[PDB]
Structure 1
Amino acid sequence: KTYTLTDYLKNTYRLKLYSLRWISDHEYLYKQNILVFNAEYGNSSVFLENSTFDEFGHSINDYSISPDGQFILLEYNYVKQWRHSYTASYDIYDLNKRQLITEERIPNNTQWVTWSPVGHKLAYVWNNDIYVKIEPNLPSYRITWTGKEDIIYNGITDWVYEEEVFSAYSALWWSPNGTFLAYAQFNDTEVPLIEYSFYSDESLQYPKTVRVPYPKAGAVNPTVKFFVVNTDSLSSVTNATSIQITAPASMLIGDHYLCDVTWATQERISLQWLRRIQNYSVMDICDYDESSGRWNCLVARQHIEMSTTGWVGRFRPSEPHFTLDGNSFYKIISNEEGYRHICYFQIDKKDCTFITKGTWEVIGIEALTSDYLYYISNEYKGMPGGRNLYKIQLSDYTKVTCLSCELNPERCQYYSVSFSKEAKYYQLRCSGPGLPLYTLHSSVNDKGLRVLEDNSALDKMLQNVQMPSKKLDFIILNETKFWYQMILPPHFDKSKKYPLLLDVYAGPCSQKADTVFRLNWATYLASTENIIVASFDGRGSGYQGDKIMHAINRRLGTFEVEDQIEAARQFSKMGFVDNKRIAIWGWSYGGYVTSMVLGSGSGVFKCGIAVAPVSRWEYYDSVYTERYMGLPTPEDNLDHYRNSTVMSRAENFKQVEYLLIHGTADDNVHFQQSAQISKALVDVGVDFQAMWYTDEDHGIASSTAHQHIYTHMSHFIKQCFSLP
């Protein structure tokens, strides 16, 4: 038998995870029941039983143990908002007594909650204001009084900061020992609202209009203010006093963003700010002052990170990792040859020294100790789509050890890591070419303690199914390596001609050719329909240096689009591809590129599917769009904004079969974007197929809609490929 659409949609074959949350430097929690595990022995006692909260009445979505292990926070009444944001009810459970607190409870509709990093202090956001609980059963102190729905956000992000800047709803930062609470304040007063209908359940007589403050390209952005409150000197008599830290003079001169918050020590915080033109950012290092109670960020302690060839950072400037004394830090920046490497900074000195070098990139700094910096990179075998954990000796930068490279080179070439509280242990997460493998390691000697999850259950289930394989490789274009992957049908025959589906994203810093094992739609297409599904990382793609990544700076809808067409041409020349049956599909940026490709009039592609595509860049949000496109003004980049629309390519869609799909409640890529594509196609008399999804957002992630869209897409591709 084969891996079917049903298998994909119903998860017949499930990849087991081994999700753990470190509680200390040698203990971690795991759900089977919730057990505590020992890293030394692997023994486990039950921490809270299957039904410890039986007579609760509510359904528990998640939990959060306080750092000192004295209280547990139960989260229920989960209502998803955007990508990361949501609302929930909360209860505090005294662990020393095993009983829910009933006094001064956390209110319903709480936007964000968090423990302080030590002890059991609590900070939550409710109705856009910040409250603090020193003790779970004591009244909370109100920190901010300016909270206003859709307008002022204290300690939580607005739509655009949530999606594009912090990848989080929270804008609350505890100092390491919980003394200070730092937060951001966002003002959306003059930011225009995107409006769309929400139809809701059949019983709703009149559709509801959703209105979300959302800055599209070149519109009025939110403004940001930054505060730090002392949670140890809180009065129950007077209103708490918040100390503002103003953005540096180089940022105040125009529109800007707060793009990073990172505490260095107990009395030192680092903030990164980004100009609206995102090629200039500044890091301030701010110290708490004694006989003034204020925060001072010495002009001399400013660190500038700018780019001559593009934007700054992969998606934002990278975060700093301070040494314990906070007089030094490490961060990933692109070197003089454009490759992202770790640079070592002195709090006071302008120049940093690079501690990594080469024609590969550091992905992330993972942990810092007294003697070692740990990082993940794609250095192993010059493969940008592999991921390995390396150890770098701080006293000698040349002494670099790959901790994961050789553990299982056959099945594992893509690792992530999770260190214990003080990096004494680490769990390795291999998502590698073979089935995922989760292993525990002692960092003192780098030996492997034990296998946590090996997916042998999946492994034997899969023994009985004709499974596809992955070919990961590169082609040469202009004396440059460009990587691609193919999901090849089972019993693949080089001498026979297969239909090929080109799976595209191709956004700036994207990577679609990697060593990750996946069970997805492509898996079914290859396994059952005998379709090759290819992906390709061309210009604009990430983790290969700025020469490649910055190629599309200010030129979205050009090189990354052309390169996808070129990749398909190269794939025809591999001899096992039926060039009468090449297709392309993508979601979001992938939707855009698919559409741009189908409208290019290249003649390479028979058909395509665009899901929730951007159709023109003025329709998309400011932070993301302007990062690559600049501003849509006559003095900046209007001409290319005007040039890079799918609408302008409508005529060329006469040569191809198109499917356009979009959820009507997409807060991210607004239905508007597809509504304009469809209108333009109609206006030039192009026939095509469409599908809207009522009330689905950008994820089209309802169990039923998810199943419906993939089913619908399968029929379209099978129809396009003459597959019965």
Structure 2
Amino acid sequence: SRKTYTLTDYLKNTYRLKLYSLRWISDHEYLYKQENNILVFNAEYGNSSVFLENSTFDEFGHSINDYSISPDGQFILLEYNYVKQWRHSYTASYDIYDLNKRQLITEERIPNNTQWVTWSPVGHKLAYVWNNDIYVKIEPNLPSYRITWTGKEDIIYNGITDWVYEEEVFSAYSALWWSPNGTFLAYAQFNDTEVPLIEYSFYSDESLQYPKTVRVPYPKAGAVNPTVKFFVVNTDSLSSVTNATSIQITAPASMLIGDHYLCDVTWATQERISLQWLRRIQNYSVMDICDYDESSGRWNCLVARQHIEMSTTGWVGRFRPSEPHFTLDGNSFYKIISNEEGYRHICYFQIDKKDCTFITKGTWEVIGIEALTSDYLYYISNEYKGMPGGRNLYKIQLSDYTKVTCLSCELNPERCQYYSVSFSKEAKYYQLRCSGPGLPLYTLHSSVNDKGLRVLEDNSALDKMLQNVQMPSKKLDFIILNETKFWYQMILPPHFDKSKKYPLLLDVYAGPCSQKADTVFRLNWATYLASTENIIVASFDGRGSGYQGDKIMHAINRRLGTFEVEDQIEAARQFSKMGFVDNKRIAIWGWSYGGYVTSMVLGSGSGVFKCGIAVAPVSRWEYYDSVYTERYMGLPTPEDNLDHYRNSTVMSRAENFKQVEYLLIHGTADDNVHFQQSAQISKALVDVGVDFQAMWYTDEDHGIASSTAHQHIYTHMSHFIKQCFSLP
């Protein structure tokens, strides 16, 4: 093949991966969009066709960002006027459409700048947050009853996460939960009153004559956190002329003794909701189970049905403690927790019994509980071929815990080692989403039979074009460092000749529970570098990395900026112990956590690496947010861990940068890793007379994700590497 995967291929998206994005609404009915056409595929027969023609909204009057169909097939929510806030959060505008009655509503509309909105999980009620206050609407035209009255901007958050909760805990803007009926609106309240603010400049269009100052309630390590109250309200019994009563659920006693976060809300039954609470020191959590006193109107969390989760070697959970899965009756649950040997497995609990029973075991981990039937529990794990880089669907028999069937391991062993799954309601049917090492492969299935009905997308189009191009290949292997196996992955250039010396780029993330070596098919920067510029792009999962059990993962506990960084160096040495590395031309790079590691590595003065790029790096843990930082580091106080805190900064390593070429890039409106962190590094290197290279990106955040800038930054970075490696 004469052609090659080029920078412009990557940047302009020459070769598209096709996804198959479906959405179940019954136990056999899902949706697929097509040239604006919302079809409804019937997995049971195949006699699928129109649900909503593409032209239905050619007159609508606005560009349509997203849609939500009420579960009861009666309405469609129309999300237009999208405006991003943080990672998950945004505000939008919303119109409701009567499907049964070919008509768009016009009365008692859902207001512009709405923070969140969602259907009741059965029926067609609407919960919406606007101005920090929650509103309910039983019918798509009746006035909305105001649940909360305390919403103040950047102080009181009703039904929605503040910044830290958004990013660190829940990964959504939304702090609302429906009871599977439609009766109860569970919601949390966040008081940011004494949280400090991060303040940075936003410059906007050329036209804006004074830069605006952005101000964000953001708790850095050891600062004052937000506080949380949790409430439940009845939706049915809602007088259109009395301010509703929301029954607060107070937390456990072991929690109220001090700083705590709310770290899970999972409903069990129509009148039973679970909560999990985490202490500010995140090695101790508790789960409450609370029933509705149908005569009293209160909520009762039986001290005898609490369940403690804790760790002596580390923190609780991968990032947070896992969610529980309740059986129809809601008297027992399944939950992934760490076992005695330190492996995340499925433990089966009874509401009232302290001890659970491990219904899976071994040297490997459960990734997620996916669905639970009367007969089976389905879960994804990296058990197959002893490979933590891999993902598969498995099936366990409820009536017998040794009847484990792998549903995916065998379908396409060569093409498909990284599965994910989407189940129909009642888990009647399921989609498998294969992500590598071959091209993504979407296929549909029936639980009952296990037989593979239909191939939904096999990307053979993409595959056609790829035969024309000199693709890199991808080695996934381990090396042994103690009696421990540490996985790496290399992206080998085309026609890789093991006797030649290739230049190597060490691509780094390295954060707690990271996994940079996997079986996933990717078309990114690395592809352009290997293919066109004949650069091996490595990645390595050392200590602190996840899915290999608490011994590797918690190795980094209270010691961030150490083993993970050192393993990264070690890994490089080992690649040059192999024979294909021009050890006069090893580079490093990374973004976010991985920019930090790349900065630490460069400052280590191991003289292994020539140059390096840090994108949006952490430079000092006291600058990052409390909930992340503390999870690993605890409190920056001399009675706690102020020592490793002060010992793990990039600035303290500035002298050693004399030995390297360094490119530092930061977006200026990074709400997350504040430009501050990069500004401190620069100042440090300036103070010590080290030259380096810098780039900022005006009005850009942690993603540097705008079309123009993403192009600019990968371009810029490309030259830097080429220059560093001397490539004409």
Q: What CA distance in whole angstroms lies between the structure 2 residues aligned with 1:550 and 1:450?
A: 43
CA deviation digits over 1:274-330, x for unaligned, max 9?
000000000000000022101100111110000000000000000000111010000
Could you say what secondary structure the match of 1:665 adopts?
coil
Whether 2:146 is the aligned partner of 1:158: answer: no
Q: Percent identity?
A: 100
CA deviation digits over 1:538-572, x for unaligned, max 9?
00000000000000000000000000000000000
Q: What CA distance in whole angstroms lies between the structure 2 residues aligned with 1:17 and 1:574?
A: 37
1:100 Cα deviation (Å)? 1.0
Q: What CA distance in whole angstroms lies between the structure 2 residues aligned with 1:43 and 1:62?
A: 26
- Matched with 1:346 is 350
1:12 Cα deviation (Å)? 0.5
CA deviation digits over 1:647-675, x for unaligned, max 9?
00000000000000000000000000000
CA deviation digits over 1:9-33, x for unaligned, max 9?
0110000000100011101111111
Q: How does 1:399-548 map to 2 (within 5 A)?
A: 399-548=403-552
Could you say what secondary structure the match of 2:232 adopts?
strand
Q: How many residues align?
A: 724
1:56 Cα deviation (Å)? 1.5
Q: What CA distance in whole angstroms lies between the structure 2 residues aligned with 1:676 and 1:558?
A: 20
RMSD over equivalenced CA pairs, Å: 0.5
CA deviation digits over 1:374-399, x for unaligned, max 9?
00000001000100000000111111
Whether 2:151 is the aligned partner of 1:147: answer: yes
Q: What CA distance in whole angstroms lies between the structure 2 residues aligned with 1:383 and 1:55?
A: 52
Match of 1:27 among 16, 26, 29: 29
CA deviation digits over 1:457-503, x for unaligned, max 9?
00001010000011000000011000000000000000000000000
Q: What CA distance in whole angstroms lies between the structure 2 residues aligned with 1:125 and 1:51?
A: 31
Could you say what secondary structure the match of 2:442 adopts?
strand
Could you say what secondary structure the match of 1:441 adopts?
strand
Could you say what secondary structure the match of 2:210 adopts?
coil
CA deviation digits over 1:222-269, x for unaligned, max 9?
000000000010111100100000011011000000000000000000
Could you say what secondary structure the match of 1:640 adopts?
helix
CA deviation digits over 1:504-541, x for unaligned, max 9?
00000000000000000000000100000000000000
Q: What CA distance in whole angstroms lies between the structure 2 residues aligned with 1:530 and 1:588?
A: 26
Match of 2:632 among 628, 635, 651: 628
1:44 Cα deviation (Å)? 2.6
CA deviation digits over 1:577-632, x for unaligned, max 9?
00000000000000000000000000000000000000000000000000000000
- Matched with 1:322 is 326
Q: What CA distance in whole angstroms lies between the structure 2 residues aligned with 1:629 and 1:387?
A: 30
Q: What CA distance in whole angstroms lies between the structure 2 residues aligned with 1:178 and 1:498?
A: 61
Q: What CA distance in whole angstroms lies between the structure 1 residues aligned with 2:302 and 2:566?
A: 47
Q: What CA distance in whole angstroms lies between the structure 1 residues aligned with 2:46 and 2:287?
A: 42
CA deviation digits over 1:386-420, x for unaligned, max 9?
00000000111111000000000001000000000
1:43 Cα deviation (Å)? 3.6
Q: What CA distance in whole angstroms lies between the structure 2 residues aligned with 1:519 and 1:43?
A: 36
Q: What CA distance in whole angstroms lies between the structure 1 residues aligned with 2:338 and 2:604?
A: 34
Q: What CA distance in whole angstroms lies between the structure 1 residues aligned with 2:99 and 2:556?
A: 54
Match of 1:369 among 367, 370, 373: 373
1:34 Cα deviation (Å)? 1.1
Q: What CA distance in whole angstroms lies between the structure 2 residues aligned with 1:396 and 1:205?
A: 70
Whether 2:73 is the aligned partner of 1:69: answer: yes
CA deviation digits over 1:63-92, x for unaligned, max 9?
000000101000000000000000000000
1:421 Cα deviation (Å)? 1.0
Q: What CA distance in whole angstroms lies between the structure 2 residues aligned with 1:51 and 1:592?
A: 50
Q: What CA distance in whole angstroms lies between the structure 2 residues aligned with 1:99 and 1:171?
A: 31
Q: What CA distance in whole angstroms lies between the structure 2 residues aligned with 1:609 and 1:20?
A: 38
1:48 Cα deviation (Å)? 1.5
Q: What CA distance in whole angstroms lies between the structure 2 residues aligned with 1:293 and 1:662?
A: 53
- Matched with 1:573 is 577
Q: What CA distance in whole angstroms lies between the structure 1 residues aligned with 2:261 and 2:334?
A: 22
1:219 Cα deviation (Å)? 0.2
Match of 1:712 among 681, 705, 716: 716
Q: What CA distance in whole angstroms lies between the structure 2 residues aligned with 1:160 and 1:486?
A: 35
Could you say what secondary structure the match of 1:522 adopts?
helix
1:681 Cα deviation (Å)? 0.3
Could you say what secondary structure the match of 2:269 adopts?
coil
Q: What CA distance in whole angstroms lies between the structure 1 residues aligned with 2:39 and 2:12?
A: 29
Could you say what secondary structure the match of 2:530 adopts?
helix
Match of 1:700 among 697, 704, 707: 704
Q: What CA distance in whole angstroms lies between the structure 2 residues aligned with 1:315 and 1:449?
A: 37
Provide closer, same or farther for how the CA distance between residues 260 and 530 of structure 1 changes in structure 2, counting only shifts above 3 A: same
Q: What CA distance in whole angstroms lies between the structure 2 residues aligned with 1:71 and 1:318?
A: 33
CA deviation digits over 1:335-389, x for unaligned, max 9?
0000000000000000000000000000000000001000000000100010000
1:42 Cα deviation (Å)? 3.2
- Matched with 1:201 is 205
1:50 Cα deviation (Å)? 1.6
Q: What CA distance in whole angstroms lies between the structure 2 residues aligned with 1:290 and 1:339?
A: 41
CA deviation digits over 1:198-224, x for unaligned, max 9?
000000000000000000000000000
Q: What CA distance in whole angstroms lies between the structure 2 residues aligned with 1:623 and 1:220?
A: 11
Q: What CA distance in whole angstroms lies between the structure 1 residues aligned with 2:277 and 2:586?
A: 45
- Matched with 2:276 is 272
- Matched with 2:142 is 138
1:49 Cα deviation (Å)? 1.6
- Matched with 2:678 is 674
Q: What CA distance in whole angstroms lies between the structure 1 residues aligned with 2:507 and 2:86?
A: 26
- Matched with 1:355 is 359
- Matched with 1:186 is 190
1:51 Cα deviation (Å)? 2.1
Q: What CA distance in whole angstroms lies between the structure 1 residues aligned with 2:682 and 2:124?
A: 54
Q: What CA distance in whole angstroms lies between the structure 2 residues aligned with 1:424 and 1:145?
A: 43
1:55 Cα deviation (Å)? 1.7
- Matched with 2:19 is 17
Q: What CA distance in whole angstroms lies between the structure 1 residues aligned with 2:277 and 2:142?
A: 37
Q: What CA distance in whole angstroms lies between the structure 2 residues aligned with 1:582 and 1:127?
A: 52
Q: What CA distance in whole angstroms lies between the structure 1 residues aligned with 2:24 and 2:15?
A: 28
Could you say what secondary structure the match of 2:411 adopts?
coil
1:432 Cα deviation (Å)? 1.7
Most deviating of 39-48 and 488-497: 39-48
What TM-score do you get using the length of structure 1 for normalisation? 1.00
Q: What CA distance in whole angstroms lies between the structure 1 residues aligned with 2:241 and 2:440?
A: 55
Could you say what secondary structure the match of 1:544 adopts?
coil
CA deviation digits over 1:414-463, x for unaligned, max 9?
00000001100000000020000000000001110110000000000101
1:706 Cα deviation (Å)? 0.3
1:57 Cα deviation (Å)? 1.3
- Matched with 2:561 is 557
Match of 1:240 among 244, 250, 253: 244
Q: What CA distance in whole angstroms lies between the structure 2 residues aligned with 1:382 and 1:640?
A: 35
CA deviation digits over 1:146-195, x for unaligned, max 9?
00100000000100000000000000000001110000000000000000
Q: What CA distance in whole angstroms lies between the structure 2 residues aligned with 1:48 and 1:622?
A: 47
Provide structure 2 residue ranges, at least 5 long, that are not aligned to the other structure.
none
Q: What CA distance in whole angstroms lies between the structure 2 residues aligned with 1:366 and 1:54?
A: 38
Could you say what secondary structure the match of 2:118 adopts?
strand
- Matched with 2:7 is 5
1:41 Cα deviation (Å)? 3.0
Could you say what secondary structure the match of 2:453 adopts?
strand
1:54 Cα deviation (Å)? 1.7
Could you say what secondary structure the match of 1:627 adopts?
helix
1:688 Cα deviation (Å)? 0.3
